[PDB]
Amino acid sequence: PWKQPELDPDTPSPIFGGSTGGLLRKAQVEEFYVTTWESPKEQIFEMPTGGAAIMRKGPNLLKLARKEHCLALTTQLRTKFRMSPCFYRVYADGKVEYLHPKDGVYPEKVNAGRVGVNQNMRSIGKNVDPIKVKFTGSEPFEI
Amino acid sequence: WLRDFLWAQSSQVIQSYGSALSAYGLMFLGAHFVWAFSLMFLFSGRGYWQELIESIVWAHNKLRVAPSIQPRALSITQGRAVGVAHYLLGGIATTWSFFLARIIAVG
Amino acid sequence: TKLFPKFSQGLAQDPSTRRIWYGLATAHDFESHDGMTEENLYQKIFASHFGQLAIIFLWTSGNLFHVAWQGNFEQWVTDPIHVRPIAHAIWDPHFGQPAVEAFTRGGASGPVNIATSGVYQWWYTIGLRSNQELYVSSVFLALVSAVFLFAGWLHLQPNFQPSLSWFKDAESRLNHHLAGLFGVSSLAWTGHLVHVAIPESRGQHVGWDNFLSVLPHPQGLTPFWSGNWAAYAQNPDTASHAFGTADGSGTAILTFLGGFHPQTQSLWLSDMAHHHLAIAVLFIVAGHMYRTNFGIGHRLEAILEAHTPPAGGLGAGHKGLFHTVNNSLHFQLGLALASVGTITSLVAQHMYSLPPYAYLAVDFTTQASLYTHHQYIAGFIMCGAFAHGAIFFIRDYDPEQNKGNVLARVLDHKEAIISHLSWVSLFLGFHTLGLYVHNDVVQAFGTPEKQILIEPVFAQWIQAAQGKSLYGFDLLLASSSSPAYSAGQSLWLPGWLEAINNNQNSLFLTIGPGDFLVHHAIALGLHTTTLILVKGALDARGSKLMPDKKDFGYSFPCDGPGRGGTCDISAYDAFYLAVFWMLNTIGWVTFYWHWKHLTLWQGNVSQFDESSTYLMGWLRDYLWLNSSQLINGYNPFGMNSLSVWAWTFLFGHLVYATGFMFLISWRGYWQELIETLVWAHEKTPLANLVYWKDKPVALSIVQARLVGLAHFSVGYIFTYAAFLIASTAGRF
Amino acid sequence: EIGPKRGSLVKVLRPESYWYNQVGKVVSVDQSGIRYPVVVRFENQNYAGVSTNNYALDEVTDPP
Amino acid sequence: AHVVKIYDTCIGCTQCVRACPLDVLEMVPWDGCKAAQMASSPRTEDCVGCKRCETACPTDFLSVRVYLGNESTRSLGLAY
Amino acid sequence: DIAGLTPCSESKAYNKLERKELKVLDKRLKKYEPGSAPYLALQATKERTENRFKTYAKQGLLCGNDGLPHLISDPGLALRFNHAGEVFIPTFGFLYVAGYIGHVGRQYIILSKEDAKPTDKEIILDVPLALKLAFQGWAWPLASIQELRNGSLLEKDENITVSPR
Amino acid sequence: HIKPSAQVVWPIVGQEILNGDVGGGFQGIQITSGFFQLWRASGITSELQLYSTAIGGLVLAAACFFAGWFHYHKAAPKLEWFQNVESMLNHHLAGLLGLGSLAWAGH
Ligand code: CLA
Ligand code: CLA
Ligand code: CLA
Ligand code: CLA
Ligand code: CLA
Ligand SMILES: CC1=C(/C=C/C(C)=C/C=C/C(C)=C/C=C/C=C(C)/C=C/C=C(C)/C=C/C2=C(C)CCCC2(C)C)C(C)(C)CCC1
Ligand SMILES: CC1=C(C/C=C(\C)CCC[C@H](C)CCC[C@H](C)CCCC(C)C)C(=O)c2ccccc2C1=O
Ligand code: SF4
């Protein structure tokens, strides 16, 4: 966004019961993902890995073992309540990463501030045959 | 189990021909057919069948019998449904024919 | 980061259990290996070919050693019609006391296994008599296997690895292999036959101690330096002759009587001697054809580019095709595998009718197992040939290199080829199933005369042209006034006619309407398998549903649920679906062979003639009648030597059903179940201390199809081999 | 102005397209100078489900 | 991880980025289409290959292409 | 007497099969009174059996070593010998009807394609045009030959969807 | 001594062998549903009573189809009518099951 936000350790979490679907040993060994949002009131949502949880009026915090869970929760919140949340990634050593838009106005928009990457100016099907790139290590679509 | 139930019995189904219960043998073999025919819709997928349908569409396009409705392969859920339906129908009719012929020719 | 996949660094980065399976599956896919050039790829293939040669020679050396040790080869030599062959002894410590007793077959002491491989007949035919000679053969083949392994190790060191152009030498490789690998090899084979097997079949022992003191022919090479080769065919073996002695025998090394031996029911040894000598001479002559360093010879690209018919019949003809075959190894592999499968099918169709080994026709289960084995080998090699042709079409095929040639024009109208193959397959299946069901129901109503019996007139007409006088057709070589009969009337006609008019042998059996129907069902199976394999090969690089199939590799799962669904869209998936039809087709041909030959051996050929028309009779008199002895292997009242065969039958059923387990269910329900098992192991007392290093993941979709096909084919082969061997060996 | 007439029947020669050697109706041609300004509508859907597609100038000729 | 490529046939309905529940695709300004937009894949290492963008792609052939291979702990969708 | 098959009129196994079928059919006749309706049905079945055995004989049909009649498939051999009724004339008999269905399907496809939203016509059939084409398809090979020469039957592949290989 | 039979085939194409000798001077398909046992438990003597039962069943089937047409097209109940779960349970416990059990006990 205008300034990259850093998540606060103090923020509360929604009330929930014990769910078997949740954080695993991959949270300890490898990285895990953290989702934050600011609420207007107390509403009931469904976690992507568990049941139903009543969320807190104000800031909130969710920990998800996968980024797909984080974006599923994000899409659910945006569809149901026009919520617009954001999620992060927390590594094993404590490193924090920001994957939800670095530009801040979502991938649906453009913002004229990001550079085209992995884009081919040729048409699909105009790529060369694999014989022409044989024993080179480069795929026809990677050119 | 095999020798003393499925082979000790079913000797009347195979020799049912020329008798009152020959239709049970016909039903048995048709059930074998349908049970075996289901494994196409179970093992296979859709892309190969869609490409074969494309070739058949080209064949019908060459001499202008192209249907207005585009021929498409069955959906993946549709293919699974056809496979399980044919498999269940074949197995049920197989056991039905075998049980009825054995219990009629003996009991 | 691991290093178990050394050829693939990316596969080593996979932290799941998929790394081990993909590392094992892509172990010898050198073309997709990381950092591999063409020359090193060819060198690795050379080393692997040497390794396969060493493995083959070690396996046959072990077969020789095991036969010489635990077999009854001397007892088989003394009495072939009575004493059974023995493969290896059975030392299974889980065997019971009745189990040890019930497997001392063939007049042995310990538990032994009856050999159905046919090596006893073959080794008795080629003059091997004592087990000392088999021991020497085993140690010599072990030595040559070690030599081949050393040579494979030899061509991997510096200053010994051949260059890329050495492998790409097309004319000289063909010249040398045709002249030497076939020509002088066949010449040495017929020389060994004439030196050893011809005197050993006439009571004269020829060995390394006295082969320089004995002579093959009494004329002593005077016919060869002169022109009088007719002296070698002057006194052939008479009808009343035994293969172990010299009762009424003659001194002839090259003859062409034709037919079969009256006693051994096999082709004459001198017939095969002149056959391999003529083949050797012809192959040595044909091996001096292609162009080498000398100024004479033929160039392959010149012949390919010259053979372009005018008026645009084949477009550019065969131009630009030499580099296509040379640069693409998959084209050469597919051509080699196609020819190998065709030759294997020819071998299967030709040993049974023309037995080349003494007392092979008497051993019914041996002939049946040999036929079924080589037929399934031929079919699998066919499927591999078509799959590797598809691999050629997707991996290394340049339309710009060969534009307008036969390959580009075949790819031009591929839809027409696929559609016509589909039409002929649909038409054959529709009509064949129509008459089979029609004759089934007509037989069910107690009136079997109403069934449609289409008499095979074309094949019986051919048989009459080949000498079968049972059908009464006035044809050439069957009438005495025909020029075909007069040509060769004193050469091999009275032997071939006597062999083909005798119904006791397997030479050109009489065929009825059921034979015709099962032949057209076999044609339907071949046609449908050809249809799917050809369609997968032509659609390997592009299709209307997915033009960019060449960019996704040969073996990829799918493209997704978009565009209606793209399941099993790869040419690998076409091969995987075609293996089932291959298994069904070879099952059909082996069912036909086994039932017809079983009814011939039992003497009731009328039962097969009147029962192979309708499928219920097929089932009742093949799968039910012949399985009575199979399932009684370990009956609770009594157990006999067929216990391994019933156990193997049920084993094949179980592995077939496990193939069904992998084939019906797909990955995506299994991943969630494995995730629940992961939560079970990770989150339990006394077992959370033990943790996996490779993450348990479900089998990938391509891997799922491969393992389902593997269990399917393994169970299929094992259960059919068990049933066939048990059914043939229980009665005889 | 730079492309075919609006509403005219045209033939698509794009190889990878589903409508190769087919006849479609022009619905709009862009004049802004884009990669594929000729937008056409087809009577028969593709496998995805859409019925309209855009092509370049060299991929569109009048059918005979 | 997997390789996601976007070709010039894209015309920008900004719907392929909504169908991807992994934040792999992003939209950059462009000039080769009426909408002046073009799909881009900055976080291509976070893609699993679910091909939902291919289902959402309306062009024939598809502007966005996802190629499988070289799987990792994030592209395999394991939470363990 | 071709391919070692005796005629059905002079075959011993054919008559033995007829005697066996008459024996089992008359076995069920002893369990019913002659004035019953199952007796009449069994009598009609026996009459149909005797009529079928009589008509299958003396018609050029032949059989060999089984008592079950055989069919000759080779043309010419089925023309020099009286065997064209087995498969030779049924071949043209089926092809006439097979070409009948293909022709009326082609004419209906062509007629429906020159109409607005032709996909609806496949699921919403029209009776008067289909029945008119059904009764105007007797001369199917005459319509097929004339369309073959002039290009209306076929179509050049420049308007035919072809694979992108 | 007489096997049950309630399906009679036509003599059209070889099906006369399916009319098995079930005894009692009758030929037909030997049935397996056990309807004869049910018609012996529920006291039924002649075919007139079975004809009356069949005609009454046809009349009630026409009444049920007319009831479906009426209760959808002519007089469709509202959602609150279907949501009366207590009335549904009471009427299908005491009414349907209880009334049918008492009527069958009386019969
Ligand atoms: C006597 C006159 C004569 C005749 C009869 C021929 C005849 C022929 N020549 Mg020719 N020739 C002539 C004069 C003549 N030539 C002269 C003066 C020259 C100049 C020296 C040549 C030079 C020449 C060359 C250089 C070549 C030929 C070849 C051929 C053969 C192939 C023709 C062709 O285009 O493929 C046929 C046309 C096609 C379009 C092919 C269609 C094939 C279909 C699609 C396959 C159908 C498969 C089907 C499913 C099979 C079913 C079987 C079932 C069991 C399943 C053909 C037999 C070619 C050859 O050797 O081929 C054998 C070749 O390379 N000719
Ligand atoms: C024994 C079981 C069985 C049977 C009967 C078939 C039959 C068929 N498969 Mg096959 N297949 C099977 C198992 C089987 N498959 C298995 C296990 C696999 C592995 C996945 C495959 C893989 C496979 C592939 C990959 C392909 C086939 C194809 C075919 C067709 C070949 C054309 C032919 O022979 O003429 C027709 C054969 C028939 C047996 C006719 C069946 C129809 C009869 C007339 C009954 C029709 C219904 C009847 C009139 C009653 C109507 C009412 C009823 C519908 C309720 C045919 C429909 C090919 C195909 O479809 O291309 C054209 C093809 O490409 N199959
Ligand atoms: C001598 C002939 C020959 C040669 C040189 C090759 C060589 C090759 N093929 Mg080909 N192929 C052949 C025969 C041959 N194949 C045959 C006969 C078939 C049909 C079965 C195939 C089918 C085939 C396919 C479908 C594919 C190849 C591929 C390959 C490549 C790598 C395969 C490999 O080594 O992985 C090593 C593989 C393993 C070690 C796995 C072994 C598991 C086996 C097959 C299962 C057997 C079942 C069972 C477990 C056996 C034991 C019985 C049990 C009861 C104990 C390589 C270029 C692949 C390729 O090019 O990569 C994209 C590919 O996709 N081939
Ligand atoms: C009358 C319409 C019609 C016509 C002229 C054709 C013509 C053709 N088809 Mg097609 N086909 C049709 C309908 C038609 N088909 C339908 C409805 C289906 C879906 C079941 C198929 C499925 C099909 C396949 C799967 C294949 C063909 C193939 C073929 C070719 C071989 C000839 C043949 O008998 O195929 C055999 C055709 C069938 C077995 C389909 C029978 C279905 C019935 C008979 C069609 C009913 C149409 C209806 C009565 C017309 C309405 C009449 C009107 C007055 C209302 C030929 C180009 C083959 C090919 O590519 O050859 C090059 C091929 O592999 N067709
Ligand atoms: C005591 C009263 C009574 C009785 C006997 C029934 C009986 C029945 N109800 Mg119920 N129902 C009732 C009150 C009653 N209902 C009330 C008060 C409500 C509103 C809460 C409903 C709402 C309701 C729903 C929403 C449904 C039923 C259905 C059914 C049928 C279930 C089929 C079955 O199990 O096989 C038993 C089958 C038979 C006994 C066959 C004979 C059927 C006869 C003709 C019905 C006669 C009973 C009827 C109440 C008589 C008065 C109707 C009058 C206007 C003619 C069954 C006939 C299902 C249905 O649609 O079927 C109609 C269904 O889905 N019921
Ligand atoms: C996919 C593909 C592929 C493959 C293919 C294949 C696999 C094939 C096969 C094929 C085959 C498998 C073929 C076969 C053929 C055969 C033939 C061609 C034969 C002939 C014969 C004859 C001609 C004979 C004659 C005769 C004589 C001589 C004697 C007796 C009589 C008679 C007359 C019969 C490749 C690699 C190319 C690549 C591309 C793609
Ligand atoms: C065979 C097959 C097909 C092809 C099958 C198709 C297109 C369905 C064909 C249905 C036919 C047209 C129904 C009618 C059948 C006959 C025409 C009826 C004849 C009746 C007589 C009286 C003439 C798939 O599409 C498929 C999809 C997904 C998984 C597996 C498979 C699969 O196995
Ligand atoms: S394959 Fe799935 S995760 Fe990857 S870019 Fe497409 S929609 Fe997103």
Ligand code: SF4
């Ligand atoms: S779905 Fe496809 S065409 Fe549409 S904006 Fe995305 S990449 Fe472009």
